[PDB]
Amino acid sequence: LGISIKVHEPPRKIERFTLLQSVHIYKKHRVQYEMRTLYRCLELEHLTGS
Amino acid sequence: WLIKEELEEMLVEKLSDLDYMQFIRLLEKLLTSQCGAAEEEFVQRFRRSVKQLIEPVQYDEQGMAFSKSEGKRKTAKAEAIVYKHGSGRIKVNGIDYQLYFPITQDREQLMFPFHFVDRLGKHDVTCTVSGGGRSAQAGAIRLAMAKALCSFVTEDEVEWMRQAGLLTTDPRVRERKKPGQEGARRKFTWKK
Amino acid sequence: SRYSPEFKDPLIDKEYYRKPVEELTEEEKYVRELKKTQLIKAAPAGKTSSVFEDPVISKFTNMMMIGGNKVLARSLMIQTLEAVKRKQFEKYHAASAEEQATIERNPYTIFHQALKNCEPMIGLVPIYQVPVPLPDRRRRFLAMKWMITECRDKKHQRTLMPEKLSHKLLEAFHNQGPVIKRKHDLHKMAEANRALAHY
Amino acid sequence: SLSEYAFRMSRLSARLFGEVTRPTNSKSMKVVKLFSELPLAKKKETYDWYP
Amino acid sequence: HYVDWRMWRDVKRRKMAYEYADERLRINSLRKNTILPKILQDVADEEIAALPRDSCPVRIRNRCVMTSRPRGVKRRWRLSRIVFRHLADHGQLSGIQRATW
Amino acid sequence: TEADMEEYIWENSSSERNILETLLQMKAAEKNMEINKEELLGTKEIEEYKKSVVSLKNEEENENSISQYKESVKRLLNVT
Amino acid sequence: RTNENDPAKHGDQHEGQHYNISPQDLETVFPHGLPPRFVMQVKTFSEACLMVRKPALELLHYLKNTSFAYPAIRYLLYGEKGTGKTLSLCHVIHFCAKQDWLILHIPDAHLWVKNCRDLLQSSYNKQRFDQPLEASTWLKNFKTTNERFLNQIKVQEKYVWNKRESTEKGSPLGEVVEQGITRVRNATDAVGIVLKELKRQSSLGMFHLLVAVDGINALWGRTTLKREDKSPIAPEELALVHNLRKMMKNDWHGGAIVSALSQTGSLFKPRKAYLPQELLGKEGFDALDPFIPILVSNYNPKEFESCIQYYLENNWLQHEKAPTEEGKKELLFLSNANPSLLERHCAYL
Ligand SMILES: Nc1ncnc2c1ncn2[C@@H]1O[C@H](COP(=O)(O)OP(=O)(O)OP(=O)(O)O)[C@@H](O)[C@H]1O
Numbered sequence A: 001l002g003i004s005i006k007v008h009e010p011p012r013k014i015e016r017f018t019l020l021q022s023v024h025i026y027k028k029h030r031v032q033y034e035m036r037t038l039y040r041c042l043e044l045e046h047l048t049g050s
Numbered sequence B: 001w002l003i004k005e006e007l008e009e010m011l012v013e014k015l016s017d018l019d020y021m022q023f024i025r026l027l028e029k030l031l032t033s034q035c036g037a038a039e040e041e042f043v044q045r046f047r048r049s050v051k052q053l054i055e056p057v058q059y060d061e062q063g064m065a066f067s068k069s070e071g072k073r074k075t076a077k078a079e080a081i082v083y084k085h086g087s088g089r090i091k092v093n094g095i096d097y098q099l100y101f102p103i104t105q106d107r108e109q110l111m112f113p114f115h116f117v118d119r120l121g122k123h124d125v126t127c128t129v130s131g132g133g134r135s136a137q138a139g140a141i142r143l144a145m146a147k148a149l150c151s152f153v154t155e156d157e158v159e160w161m162r163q164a165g166l167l168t169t170d171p172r173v174r175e176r177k178k179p180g181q182e183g184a185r186r187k188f189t190w191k192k
Numbered sequence C: 001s002r003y004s005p006e007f008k009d010p011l012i013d014k015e016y017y018r019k020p021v022e023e024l025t026e027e028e029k030y031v032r033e034l035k036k037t038q039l040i041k042a043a044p045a046g047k048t049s050s051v052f053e054d055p056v057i058s059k060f061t062n063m064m065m066i067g068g069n070k071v072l073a074r075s076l077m078i079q080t081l082e083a084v085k086r087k088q089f090e091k092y093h094a095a096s097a098e099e100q101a102t103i104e105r106n107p108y109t110i111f112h113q114a115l116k117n118c119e120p121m122i123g124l125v126p127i128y129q130v131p132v133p134l135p136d137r138r139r140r141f142l143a144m145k146w147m148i149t150e151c152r153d154k155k156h157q158r159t160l161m162p163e164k165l166s167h168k169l170l171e172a173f174h175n176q177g178p179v180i181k182r183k184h185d186l187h188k189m190a191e192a193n194r195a196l197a198h199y
Numbered sequence D: 001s002l003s004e005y006a007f008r009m010s011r012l013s014a015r016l017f018g019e020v021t022r023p024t025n026s027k028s029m030k031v032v033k034l035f036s037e038l039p040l041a042k043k044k045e046t047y048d049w050y051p
Numbered sequence E: 001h002y003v004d005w006r007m008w009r010d011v012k013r014r015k016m017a018y019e020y021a022d023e024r025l026r027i028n029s030l031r032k033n034t035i036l037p038k039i040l041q042d043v044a045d046e047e048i049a050a051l052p053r054d055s056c057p058v059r060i061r062n063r064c065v066m067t068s069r070p071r072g073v074k075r076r077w078r079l080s081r082i083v084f085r086h087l088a089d090h091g092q093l094s095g096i097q098r099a100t101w
Numbered sequence F: 001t002e003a004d005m006e007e008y009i010w011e012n013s014s015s016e017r018n019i020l021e022t023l024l025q026m027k028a029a030e031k032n033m034e035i036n037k038e039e040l041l042g043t044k045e046i047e048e049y050k051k052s053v054v055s056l057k058n059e060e061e062n063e064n065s066i067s068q069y070k071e072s073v074k075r076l077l078n079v080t
Numbered sequence G: 001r002t003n004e005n006d007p008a009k010h011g012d013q014h015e016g017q018h019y020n021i022s023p024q025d026l027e028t029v030f031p032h033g034l035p036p037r038f039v040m041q042v043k044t045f046s047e048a049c050l051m052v053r054k055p056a057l058e059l060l061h062y063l064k065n066t067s068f069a070y071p072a073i074r075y076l077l078y079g080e081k082g083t084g085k086t087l088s089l090c091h092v093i094h095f096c097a098k099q100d101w102l103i104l105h106i107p108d109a110h111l112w113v114k115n116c117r118d119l120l121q122s123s124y125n126k127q128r129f130d131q132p133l134e135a136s137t138w139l140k141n142f143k144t145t146n147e148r149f150l151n152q153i154k155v156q157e158k159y160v161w162n163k164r165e166s167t168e169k170g171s172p173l174g175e176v177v178e179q180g181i182t183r184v185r186n187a188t189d190a191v192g193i194v195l196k197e198l199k200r201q202s203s204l205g206m207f208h209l210l211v212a213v214d215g216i217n218a219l220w221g222r223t224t225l226k227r228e229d230k231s232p233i234a235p236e237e238l239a240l241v242h243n244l245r246k247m248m249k250n251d252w253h254g255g256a257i258v259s260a261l262s263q264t265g266s267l268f269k270p271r272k273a274y275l276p277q278e279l280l281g282k283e284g285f286d287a288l289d290p291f292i293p294i295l296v297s298n299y300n301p302k303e304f305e306s307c308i309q310y311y312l313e314n315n316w317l318q319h320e321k322a323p324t325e326e327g328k329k330e331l332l333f334l335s336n337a338n339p340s341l342l343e344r345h346c347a348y349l
């Protein structure tokens, strides 16, 4: 489409939390879960509204 | 000699440890028997192979000849620029080193690379360091300065610095805390 | 450890790399050639190539360190050395020439000599508290730990660590003081338990 | 307290931006913070917690 | 047909709090200031006390939306730790994965 | 007020009053009452001193600016 | 070494050479103000060899070329931390004292604005405060330094200490100084009186006053002192600080004022800050304007070599490898030719 575009990668984010592994009582033992949000930034420049 | 896994991959079969040892001993006997090239290539079929790259010198607007490198230590990253000719001046983040590093240990760490190759006062250094603490920044600047100075010392001095540890990046970083224990290794007080 | 076993400890010694090739023996040449193919650990932040680097004083400073406060321990050590040197200079200037010749003014020499004098030749371990010989590393560690513990004693009130450590080091340099007494008491106990030492 | 010029200028800026133009302690700014935000019970997470 | 009578009580509390949210907000705003006369603040206090007990938003409890567990509920997913672990372990939850670093 | 003025004005400031008083005392001590207020404030030396003081107060401070201020003060105070 | 005590000999050609303060001069001219590290160095070496540096030479030349008729010119030594501003000021003080000037030396203005638990309300002025201990110590030191002129100077006004005690006009200034020293409770007031007297005597041409204040930025900075109601105290609320502020004004002739900035011991100032404006504050710079700033920097190669040789000749560098060129380069790098860092580093070798 003839649009000036650059690309970069912002640093990823990793959100981690921890939950009790067992059901009743095993506080010493946990499971750690994480969510990874990876980013990609496309910077388009000098393009009209349409 | 290739490991048992490599031999199994080469022969697409499964071999025991004793079979591998027998084959290795036979190959060693072949090598020690003054084998010719026809057998030396056969040996090299089963042979597996076991230096630091140096940045080139650059030139600036002022006309000085310089090299630039970078290093890291813990959570600190530093970039150093060492000029071929200077007077021992080191400026960190635009600040003189004796002011940015009041601790004598950090200044000694900065001195260590130039002192090792006997080049105190023979260069000028500009460093930009970010992250970590005073000692991590000092170590990162030391590593970056050594890597940049490799471009001006002889190859023998480069090897000597590598043997002195001035060029190896310290992989020792903070170990993550694990659940169920106080720290990275400190377990909770074991009750009875 | 984050270092693989392939890594080797660095050898920070300029004289080692300044040795001429001809003086190198066959074994030394082989070692130098092998070192070119070995991974080398990064130089620790403690030791450098400085001509003033004393491993004994560095180890003593590390032992004096409390809670990773290396700056404070180094400050205490340098203050102790300065106090020792100042006391020696005062004694030298206050003494006659005949005594001036004998008076020692190097703080490093005094520190090393005091540590050597405080080294216990033989100690004791349960097997009965059997007297047993001590390796040189254990001897040096015991001397340093005894000096530090004696200086940290609550018997001294309001006196700073550098002054106390300088006083104890000067006492040990003349084979006197509580630490030398502790070493002599340990040796006396070993002599007493010589009978049980056959276990 | 403050220079009268700076005080009047800050009051003019607050009037332009719609902020409180009269002196007010935090206890009464609690009214402003109450009416600026939605009530906790009115948030979609609260009244529509369970399906 | 909620999971338990506790979830039913919480649903009733949430509905009643949403119904009385604006009246509570207005009366509390009358109370939480140092400008209006103290007598008006006292009558506002008795007015807000006259409101039904279950209309107070503090009584709202964030229970798990599938097992009515009162504790161990992640606010983002509104699920108890056990149910969240089950769904994440089966992989039915997008993005969530076992954390290893 | 002084605090309300982010831009430093050299006029009616402590600098002008102090330099005028210093010059007046200097010439009174010299016994040669040859100076005048406008005559002093119009000279090039006073202009350079004002420029250096404005550069220090308003723009930035560094070794070059301090050296320039020192040179201007030395020229004004007749001591070098 | 250039073991010389004559203050009229050393000059630009003596840059890097040594200047000796005799023990009598050390005891009389300097009962205070000398940096504690150099006090220890003097007590150990049994010598008082100050290296002659360019800033000190420039200040000496300015003071030699000045005229007492002119209003008191303000000179301000400044530089990075531990560059030798205090010792340059001390060198100037000693030279002026040998020139038979009257030395009005403040050892440290930071002491008067911090760590004072004996603060009292001023009887002479209920809006101010008095520091009896600091004032008494400074009065003792001032009497020690300027004893020869202490009896000669005549007071110009009658001053009252209590309903029963007063000092008559025309009495020696020694009477007021000894009254302040002995009667500690009035000492602060006496200090101000002395300053006041000195100022007018300087205008009268009785002598050549040299006001020497170290850490001048403490006058217009901030004070950590607190009121009985746990309230902060402005610097001008201290009688000593207000009197020193009055003394700093250039509305008097008959000498010159010399001050030295010192971030060390300052309150509410960043460590790396050394420039005159940053250390002084806007009010301080306005009060001191106009002034001649003199930059004190690290040693040059010649000065560093001279200092190292002076330490070696005194055998201070007891380490075996110190005399070697490698040790000299190591010391130069680890100190960056900074006099304080170099001395502290060499103190444990
Ligand atoms: N001219 C000199 N000759 C010898 N030693 C000097 C000289 N100038 C400074 N020093 C050294 O500097 C140290 C003291 O520094 P000094 O107090 O003079 O400097 P400063 O920057 O004014 O200090 P501070 O910021 O602590 O007030 C001493 O160890 C002293 O030996």
Ligand SMILES: Nc1nc2c(ncn2[C@@H]2O[C@H](COP(=O)(O)OP(=O)(O)O)[C@@H](O)[C@H]2O)c(=O)[nH]1
Residues within 6 Å of the ligand: G124, G158, G159, G160, G161, G188, G189, G190, G192, G193, G196, G239, G243
């Ligand atoms: N006790 C006492 N102190 C005096 C007397 N005269 C002067 N002083 C001291 O000298 C200072 C006088 O300063 P002054 O010239 O009055 O300055 P001013 O207060 O701003 O007008 C005060 O701080 C007093 O402590 C006196 O007669 N008795």
